[PDB]
Amino acid sequence: MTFSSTSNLKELLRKVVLDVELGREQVQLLYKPIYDSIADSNL
Amino acid sequence: TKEMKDFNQTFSVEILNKSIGESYNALLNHIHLSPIINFNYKASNKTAFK
Amino acid sequence: PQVMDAKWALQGNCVFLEHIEGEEIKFGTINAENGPVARIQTYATGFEY
Amino acid sequence: FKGQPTPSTITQITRAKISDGKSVRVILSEGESTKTQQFYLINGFFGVAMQDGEKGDEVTLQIEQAEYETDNIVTSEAFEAGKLIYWDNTAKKFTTTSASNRLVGRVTDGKDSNNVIWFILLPQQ
Amino acid sequence: TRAKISDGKSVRVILSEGESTKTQQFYLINGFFGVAMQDGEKGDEVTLQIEQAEYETDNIVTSEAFEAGKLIYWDNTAKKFTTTSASNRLVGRVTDGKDSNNVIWFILLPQQ
Amino acid sequence: FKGQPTPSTITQITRAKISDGKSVRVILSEGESTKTQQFYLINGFFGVAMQDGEKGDEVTLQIEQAEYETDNIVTSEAFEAGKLIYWDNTAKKFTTTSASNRLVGRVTDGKDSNNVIWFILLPQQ
């Protein structure tokens, strides 16, 4: 009896995944202090 | 394809909207800050390290 | 999903052999059952009036 | 994610269809300039220019393979419906002569009084 | 003003003196090969289809196998499809091979 | 309708346009295989094999005549914008040489530093 025999049968074993916190960093609007907004829907 | 949305567990329109928003914010930063960077500054503006 | 999970189970096999004085008892083993696999398909048609 | 805490591998999911192919951007050459809604042959692509390009800039050509109305035909020749159309890049005009011109379409409506042709654009071969 | 006037999925033609077309059949009229959406008479205006789409038809020469992928040529003299590749006009490529009922699925081509 | 009360007569209305025909089903032969979003020539049809197939399986090829991002070219050749594209079925790579290869497209964006190309797909002639 050895765990190595049943290692390949992944469906028998409990599946645990370690959290990594992977993704894409948020992209902020850095240009706001410099510019003067002119919002008009008929330019 | 409809099959990709319906059968794929993780795929969704939410991640597509996230990608759209991220690229949009980066586009805004580029549009409103690349004129500042790419400009050919004359010697009047430029200041040395000193 | 388009392909269904396969049910699994673990089963322990053993056999009783009657023991005489001074023979090592043979040990059993373990076998794993596997269920069937089902698949989901997409059917479609339509008209162009 | 710069400075991520764990070396997460990245797997690219392949993709082929980049766009619809209705139109294509093209860079103007030196001795070229385009105005809107006129046919041109720029870098091997024949289509209707959708922007006014002046020099060394980027313009979009429409290659939709749809039906197009166009002036700018060699009025000496008569364009009956069904005849193949060719593009004379030297004269910048449509013609039925197949000497070395580029095949670009087939006529639907014959040559009318106003030198106007309705023709079906071709697959850019 | 716009150069594009219509999507080009269909094209109008005028029937000559030796041409007559019935609904939903293939006809080579004035260099355009398509499916006529109207039953036409001499000197009448009809509309053909050049939609580059998959089309069904049994109007074929029943002598040679139309295995999938082979080019389909339209013989105006006999008014039939065939794989001769002679001076007959090229019109499509077979998607689904011929069945026992002599039915073909093929993709139209851009009239070049 | 079997066993109908009355001898009715059924008249068919003909319909030629079976389908839009933007893609075509095809069956893999012995010496052919596919994986998703890769270009292939199968049974005279050239397109993007949208599904995996190995042996006698059914796969579908995109023939939309849209713009496609491919890579997978003969790297030694130069691919300027507008140049015609040919598929070398022996090498299973795109190329501009027209020796015995199928004409399949025209480049919209030239060969970049990583051999990527955008090109219009052609009507499978």
The tokens describing B11, both together, are 């795929």
- Are D118 and D69 contacting, i.e. CB atoms less than 8 angstroms apart? yes
CB contact set of F90 (below 8 Å; sequence gap of 6+):
none
Beta bridge mates, D19: F67
Per the CB < 8 A criterion, the answer to whether E51 and E45 are in contact is no
Interface of B with C (CB under 8 A): 3, 7, 9
Inter-residue contact D15 to D26 (CB < 8 Å): no
Residue matched to tokens 């028998």: A12
Q: Name D58's bridge partners.
A: D27
Strands E71-75 and E89-96: antiparallel
d(CA D120, CA D64): 10
The shortest C-alpha distance from F14 to chain E (Å) reads 6
F48/F41 Cα distance (integer angstroms): 9
> Could you tell me the two tokens for D116?
């106007």
Question: Largest Cα–Cα distance of chain D, in whole Å?
Answer: 75
Query: Which chain E residues contact residue D123 at CB under 8 A?
Result: 110, 112
- Length of chain D equals 125
- In this structure, what token pair is assigned to residue B8? 């794929």
User: Is residue C14 helix, strand or coil?
Assistant: coil
The C-alpha atoms of residue A28 and residue B32 are separated, in whole angstroms, by 13
| Nearest-CA distance D3 → chain A (Å) | 10
Residue F18: CB atoms within 10 A of its CB come to 17
Q: In 3D, which of D74, D67, D66 has the Cα closest to residue D115?
A: D74
Give Cα separations from E27 to A30, D37, E31, F43 (angstroms).
64, 33, 10, 27
* Whole-number Å distance between alpha carbons of F36 and F53: 9
Residues in B closer than 8 angstroms to A31, CB to CB, are: 28-29, 32-33
Contact D1 A24 (CB under 8 A): yes
Q: Are E110 and D123 in contact (CB under 8 A)?
A: yes
D83 vs E contacts (CB less than 8 Å): 31
Query: Which CA distances in Å does D20 have to D35, D64, E4, F68, F107?
Result: 24, 10, 17, 9, 14
> Does F114 contact D at CB distance below 8 Å?
no
- Yes or no: say if D63 and D124 are a contact pair by the CB < 8 Å rule: yes
Say if F84 is an interface residue toward chain D (CB within 8 Å): yes
| Residue F96, both tokens | 């501009």
Dihedral sign for Cα D97, D102, D108, D109, please: negative
Q: Look at E25 and F45 and tell me if their CB atoms are within 8 Å.
A: no
In sequence order, the 6+-apart residues with CB closer than 8 A to the CB of B39 are none
Interchain CB contact of E13 with D (< 8 Å):
yes
Q: How far is CA F18 from CA E53, E67, E96, in A?
A: 8, 18, 12
Q: Cβ contact (<8 Å) for F25 and E95?
A: yes
DSSP A1-43: --TTTTSS-TTTSPP-------S------TTTTT------TT-
Do E1 and D37 touch, CB atoms closer than 8 A?
yes
